[PDB]
Amino acid sequence: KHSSDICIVGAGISGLTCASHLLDSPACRGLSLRIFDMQQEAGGRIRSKMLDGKASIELGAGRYSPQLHPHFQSAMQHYSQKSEVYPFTQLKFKSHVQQKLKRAMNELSPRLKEHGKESFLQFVSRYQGHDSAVGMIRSMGYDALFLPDISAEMAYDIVGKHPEIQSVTDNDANQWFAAETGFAGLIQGIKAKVKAAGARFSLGYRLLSVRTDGDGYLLQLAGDDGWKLEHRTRHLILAIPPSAMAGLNVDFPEAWSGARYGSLPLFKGFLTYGEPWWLDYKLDDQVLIVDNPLRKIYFKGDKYLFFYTDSEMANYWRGCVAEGEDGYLEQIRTHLASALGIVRERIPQPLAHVHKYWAHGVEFCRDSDIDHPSALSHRDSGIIACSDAYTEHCGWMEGGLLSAREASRLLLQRIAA
Amino acid sequence: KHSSDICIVGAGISGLTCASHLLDSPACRGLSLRIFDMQQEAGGRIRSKMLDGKASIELGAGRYSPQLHPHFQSAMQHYSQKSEVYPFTQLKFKSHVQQKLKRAMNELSPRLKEHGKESFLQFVSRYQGHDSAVGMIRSMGYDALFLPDISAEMAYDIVGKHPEIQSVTDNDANQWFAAETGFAGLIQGIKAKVKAAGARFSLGYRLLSVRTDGDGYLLQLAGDDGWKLEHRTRHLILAIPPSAMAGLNVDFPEAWSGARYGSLPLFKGFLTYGEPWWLDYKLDDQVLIVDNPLRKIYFKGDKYLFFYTDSEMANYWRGCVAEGEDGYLEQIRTHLASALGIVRERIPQPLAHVHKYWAHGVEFCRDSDIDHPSALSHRDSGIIACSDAYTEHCGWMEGGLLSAREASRLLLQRIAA
Numbered sequence: 001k002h003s004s005d006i007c008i009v010g011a012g013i014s015g016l017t018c019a020s021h022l023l024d025s026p027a028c029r030g031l032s033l034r035i036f037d038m039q040q041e042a043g044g045r046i047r048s049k050m051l052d053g054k055a056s057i058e059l060g061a062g063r064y065s066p067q068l069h070p071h072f073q074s075a076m077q078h079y080s081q082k083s084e085v086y087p088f089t090q091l092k093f094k095s096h097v098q099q100k101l102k103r104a105m106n107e108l109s110p111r112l113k114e115h116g117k118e119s120f121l122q123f124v125s126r127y128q129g130h131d132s133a134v135g136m137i138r139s140m141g142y143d144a145l146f147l148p149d150i151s152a153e154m155a156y157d158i159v160g161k162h163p164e165i166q167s168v169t170d171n172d173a174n175q176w177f178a179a180e181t182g183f184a185g186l187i188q189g190i191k192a193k194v195k196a197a198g199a200r201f202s203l204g205y206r207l208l209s210v211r212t213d214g215d216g217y218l219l220q221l222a223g224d225d226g227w228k229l230e231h232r233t234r235h236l237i238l239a240i241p242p243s244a245m246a247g248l249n250v251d252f253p254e255a256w257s258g259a260r261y262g263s264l265p266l267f268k269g270f271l272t273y274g275e276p277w278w279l280d281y282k283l284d285d286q287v288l289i290v291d292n293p294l295r296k297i298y299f300k301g302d303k304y305l306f307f308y309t310d311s312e313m314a315n316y317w318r319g320c321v322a323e324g325e326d327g328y329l330e331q332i333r334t335h336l337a338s339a340l341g342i343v344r345e346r347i348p349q350p351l352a353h354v355h356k357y358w359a360h361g362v363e364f365c366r367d368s369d370i371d372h373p374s375a376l377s378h379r380d381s382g383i384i385a386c387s388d389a390y391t392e393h394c395g396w397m398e399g400g401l402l403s404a405r406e407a408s409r410l411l412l413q414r415i416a417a
Numbered sequence: 418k419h420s421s422d423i424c425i426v427g428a429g430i431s432g433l434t435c436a437s438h439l440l441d442s443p444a445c446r447g448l449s450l451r452i453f454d455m456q457q458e459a460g461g462r463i464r465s466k467m468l469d470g471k472a473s474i475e476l477g478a479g480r481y482s483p484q485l486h487p488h489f490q491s492a493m494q495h496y497s498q499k500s501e502v503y504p505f506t507q508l509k510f511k512s513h514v515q516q517k518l519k520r521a522m523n524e525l526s527p528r529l530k531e532h533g534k535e536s537f538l539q540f541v542s543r544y545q546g547h548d549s550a551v552g553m554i555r556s557m558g559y560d561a562l563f564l565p566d567i568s569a570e571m572a573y574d575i576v577g578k579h580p581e582i583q584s585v586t587d588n589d590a591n592q593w594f595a596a597e598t599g600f601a602g603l604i605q606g607i608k609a610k611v612k613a614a615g616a617r618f619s620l621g622y623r624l625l626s627v628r629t630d631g632d633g634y635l636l637q638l639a640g641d642d643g644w645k646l647e648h649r650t651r652h653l654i655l656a657i658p659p660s661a662m663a664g665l666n667v668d669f670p671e672a673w674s675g676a677r678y679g680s681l682p683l684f685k686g687f688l689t690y691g692e693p694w695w696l697d698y699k700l701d702d703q704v705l706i707v708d709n710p711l712r713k714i715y716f717k718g719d720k721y722l723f724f725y726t727d728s729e730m731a732n733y734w735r736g737c738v739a740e741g742e743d744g745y746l747e748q749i750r751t752h753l754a755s756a757l758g759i760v761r762e763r764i765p766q767p768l769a770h771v772h773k774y775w776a777h778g779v780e781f782c783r784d785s786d787i788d789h790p791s792a793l794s795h796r797d798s799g800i801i802a803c804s805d806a807y808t809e810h811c812g813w814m815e816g817g818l819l820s821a822r823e824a825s826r827l828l829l830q831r832i833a834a
């Protein structure tokens with residue numbers, strides 16, 4: 001038999017937290033747990049790396065707030081991961097536009113119906129012209145704020161939940177932390193605890209289809225070396241994001257919820273140097289938000305710098321990387337010089353660098369349904385779906401922990417019934 | 418994105434050698450050349466690994482014969498790669514069957530003038546018992562020899578061109594060498610020459626489809642992070658195996674050749690230990706061929722041991738691996754113990770271990786003796802296909818060198834004219 005009592009497809013933080021809750025319940029004594037992930041390492045969009053062997057960098061999720069993410073903070077403490085303060089919470093190098101509109105976003109506050117749920121750009125186009133509104137939105141360095149299906153209501157929550165811009169709203173007392181060893185240390189601790197409790201991991205296998213087979217389910221998987229594999233299970237959680245769900249044969253989203261779902265790409269690029277040349281400019285631990293394509297530039301201590309972009313600007317950088325390392329590094333240097341107000345020859349070339357493009361970096365519900373529960377259920381088959389996108393914290397690890405707790409509750413009802 | 422004058426998809430030894438022949442030619446001065454491969458490193462089924470940092474192992478190709486592979490030996494010398502004697506050229510702990518293997522193969526050979534081209538299993542059981550034929554073929558370690566479409570003709574060619582069993586057909590004239598640093602070193606030599614001459618590499622991109630587009634071709638590729646990419650070229654070599662050709666939209670194999678093609682899976686597992694325990698059995702640099710699922714067991718000096726299987730036996734192990742690393746490792750201990758005639762508890766567990774499964778390890782002409790030309794051309798579009806499977810040396814790097822030389826001539830004649 002290649003079978004299991006419970007199967008979790010997905011070994012990001014959502015899936016591994018489902019596993020951890022299930023194995024804690026005495027109702028799962030003796031039941032067997034199999035965890036699939038198409039990747040070769042657990043973590044999903046949590047991916048920590050040593051750059052040049054020197055320092056530790058976050059290619060995916062990198063920061064959290066005690067105010068916004070208390071379940072995440074508790075997870076870090078439960079698994080004894082040490083946090084460090086996250087420095088990039090203020091813009092010391094502000095602009096007239098960035099100054100102007102902290103004051104300007106209080107005014108438009110009456111958006112219940114007067115502005116409602118328009119686009120954020122359509123909204124702000126009201127207070128001042130369309131031109132002025134573009135420059136205001138651009139100065140916050142998250143290009144997703146320009147998209148039409150990003151409502152003005154959404155946008156205000158987006159802006160107050162991000163550390164670089166949170167001072168423009170009344171979320172300016174939120175505190176922020178990063179992992180010292182990287183969030184992968186947390187992924188590793190959960191994984192080890194779930195393995196020691198007897199769950200078995202099959203990493204490197206991609207789920208392709210699932211069919212209901214009697215009381216349980218039949219899964220078709222493809223290993224990344226081509227090996228085709230079938231698995232029977234009695235209970236199934238799909239701890240994968242909406243974009244992955246749509247690729248299956250399970251009638252997503254219609255058989256699952258009222259809502260439609262969307263996603264933004266993200267891009268991060270990291271560079272290290274022979275000397276921490278930015279210390280002369282008093283830039284260590286500062287973040288610059290610029291209109292040029294780097295958009296958000298970060299100087300981490302004396303160790304490295306990086307930049308972070310989304311939507312069309314993430315696709316720009318990913319395209320320019322496809323045309324080869326050389327023009328990519330040269331474009332970066334130009335835009336670094338422009339952001340500092342110096343000539344490109346004062347920017348050294350880097351020793352090492354690494355980048356990462358996430359085609360579906362953030363996945364979110366456009367709130368079409370009236371209510372939206374934390375985990376999902378197939379109306380017919382009883383498959384449970386689990387993802388940060390189904391919660392009040394879409395786009396955050398905290399949403400993963402919250403979806404997983406509901407997801408494991410729903411599955412514990414399936415055993416008790 | 419952009420374009421090229423010449424495009425090579427596939428950066429195994431075929432594609433790299435194609436590129437090398439093309440850039441040697443004055444007829445390409447000024448032409449741009451772009452090379453795609455879906456893997457992140459060049460080499461294809463040539464994959465070397467410094468297992469532990471103190472030993473070089475070959476997960477793909479591992480040995481060549483100067484007598485059978487003169488072009489490959491010449492390539493090694495051209496790129497200044499050092500060879501070393503390949504130890505596993507004979508068997509010592511021969512069982513009862515493995516002596517009769519010689520005198521029966523030398524005796525059953527006149528009968529292959531007639532009833533020669535039939536299946537090898539049913540030809541060997543047409544002059545000895547069938548219970549005797551299954552024992553004689555199995556003692557050769559290669560389960561390819563039990564299959565319908567491998568003739569008694571094409572099986573005598575296999576037995577004589579393989580180092581472990583070439584004694585069985587009076588082909589000990591043939592010496593065998595391995596690469597001192599691995600065949601990766603040859604791959605890196607070609608790659609460096611092709612880069613130094615201006616070819617542009619795009620690794621990590623998978624070709625999904627090609628369509629003719631005026632004089633040239635429009636290629637659709639998918640990066641392994643999702644990034645979709647369109648590339649326009651004027652001349653196009655597909656240096657990929659027949660299994661890869663079928664996955665495209667190019668009417669393979671009809672619009673190319675009158676031969677049909679098959680493939681076999683292969684599996685290798687490598688095990689290292691704290692103590693070279695197998696020396697007490699005088700096993701270093703020896704190879705045992707056994708009935709049990711390990712089939713061929715190799716002891717490399719006092720560095721490591723490994724085993725090598727094909728066909729159904731390769732699929733046996735890949736399934737075992739899918740059910741979990743612990744049951745796989747315990748299976749190996751069992752089959753090692755019975756092979757050496759000792760109890761399980763005298764085999765240690767391994768420190769480190771690695772394994773590779775090749776779903777299409779070998780691909781070959783099955784309309785064999787079609788006088789199959791060394792490269793193919795699409796009857797309509799003029800796309801050239803390059804692969805070891807199109808040559809007399811299907812299954813050897815030598816075949817890739819031969820196919821590459823032809824494919825580049827085809828493309829130079831069509832670049833000219």
Ligand SMILES: Cc1cc2nc3c(=O)[nH]c(=O)nc-3n(C[C@H](O)[C@H](O)[C@H](O)COP(=O)(O)OP(=O)(O)OC[C@H]3O[C@@H](n4cnc5c(N)ncnc54)[C@H](O)[C@@H]3O)c2cc1C
Pocket residue numbers: 009010011012013014015036037038039042043044045046059060061062063064205206207208239240241244266267268358360361362386387388389395396397398399400
């Ligand atoms: C660049 C970037 C920066 C981020 N920064 C932050 C931050 O600072 N703070 C924060 O809270 N969040 C951040 N996030 C988001 C955070 O990473 C996610 O919210 C969280 O990791 C999602 O966890 P998950 O388990 O729900 O999904 P995922 O992490 O996406 O894991 C899903 C897993 O399912 C696997 N999988 C998918 N599909 C299939 C299939 N068909 N078969 C098999 N297996 C499959 C995938 O391999 C994946 O490992 C960031 C994300 C990105 C891209």
Ligand SMILES: Cc1cc2nc3c(=O)[nH]c(=O)nc-3n(C[C@H](O)[C@H](O)[C@H](O)COP(=O)(O)OP(=O)(O)OC[C@H]3O[C@@H](n4cnc5c(N)ncnc54)[C@H](O)[C@@H]3O)c2cc1C
Pocket residue numbers: 426427428429430431432453454455456459460461462463476477478479480481622623624625656657658661683684685775777778779803804805812813814815816817
């Ligand atoms: C286990 C094993 C042991 C072997 N031992 C020996 C030996 O000892 N002696 C010997 O001579 N030979 C041996 N071989 C054979 C040798 O590996 C091959 O004959 C040779 O490497 C084939 O080279 P190639 O360039 O034709 O094809 P490949 O090495 O198969 O290269 C094909 C390349 O094209 C890429 N590719 C494919 N498809 C697509 C697509 N749609 N888009 C983009 N890219 C793509 C692949 O990723 C790959 O890099 C062995 C093979 C195996 C599997």
Ligand SMILES: Cc1ccc2[nH]cc(C[C@H](N)C(=O)O)c2c1
Pocket residue numbers: 062063142143144158162264310362394395396
């Ligand atoms: C551009 C964008 C838009 C909406 C978003 N919701 C959550 C995130 C992740 C955040 N940017 C982070 O990295 O912590 C995010 C990003």
Ligand SMILES: Cc1ccc2[nH]cc(C[C@H](N)C(=O)O)c2c1
Pocket residue numbers: 479480559560561575579681727779811812813
């Ligand atoms: C089983 C089988 C059948 C046919 C084959 N033609 C070439 C090879 C490669 C060889 N076995 C090696 O590993 O060097 C091979 C293998």
Ligand SMILES: [Mg+2]
Pocket residue numbers: 009010011012013014015016044239240
């Ligand atoms: Mg998950």
Ligand SMILES: [Mg+2]
Pocket residue numbers: 426427428429430431432433461656657
């Ligand atoms: Mg090739």
